[PDB]
Amino acid sequence: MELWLVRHGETLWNREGRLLGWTDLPLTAEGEAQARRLKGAMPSLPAFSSDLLRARRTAELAGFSPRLYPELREIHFGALEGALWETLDPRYKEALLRFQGFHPPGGESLSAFQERVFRFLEGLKAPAVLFTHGGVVRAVLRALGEDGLVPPGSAVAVDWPRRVLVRLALD
């Protein structure tokens, strides 16, 4: 199934290097500029978006009127919400870097996050554009055997659950 996944534009915590999960921050001016650059680049397919502000604002500026689904949210970092990556305990750093065995206190495990994301993708019955988050794009790319790191405001298209089709980035 052809799916286009968009990583929302940047927020302040992107430049500050803080873990941003369910904390509802707004896009920065540059984040909005990144979102506007997506208009016309994405295919005119049905759109779905995480209900968090930064994601559906990206969808709006990109020219879409998506239906909101919390299932497309970034992973819930629990007690780690807002933590500076720099000072994160090595065990959490390793868990996130290797994308495995992540169990944040008061939050979502990577296993629960993956189940949530993949279950949502399984329910899609036609090609669609998904406005989401870095962790979600990473989960999909890594499940397809590729590094899931894509710039804020960029997109990737995949043939789920078989392969990556294209990684798109604009300046």
TrEMBL record:
Domain of life of the source: Bacteria
Gene Ontology cellular component annotations, sorted alphabetically: cytoplasm
A Pfam family the protein falls into: His_Phos_1
Residues where substrate binds: R7, H8, G9, E10, T11, L12, W13, N14, R54
The keyword Isomerase is assigned to this record: yes
SUPFAM superfamilies (UniProt xref): Phosphoglycerate mutase-like
Record key words, sorted: Glycolysis, Isomerase, Plasmid
The UniProt record lists the keyword Nucleotide-binding: no
Matches recorded under CDD domains: HP_PGM_like
InterPro entries: His_Pase_superF_clade-1 (IPR013078), His_PPase_superfam (IPR029033), PG/BPGM_mutase_AS (IPR001345), PGM_Phosphatase (IPR050275)
GO molecular function ontology, one term from the record: phosphatase activity
Protein name per Swiss-Prot or TrEMBL: Alpha-ribazole-5'-phosphate phosphatase
Protein source organism: Thermus thermophilus (strain ATCC 27634 / DSM 579 / HB8)
Lineage, broadest ranks: Bacteria, Thermotogati, Deinococcota, Deinococci, Thermales
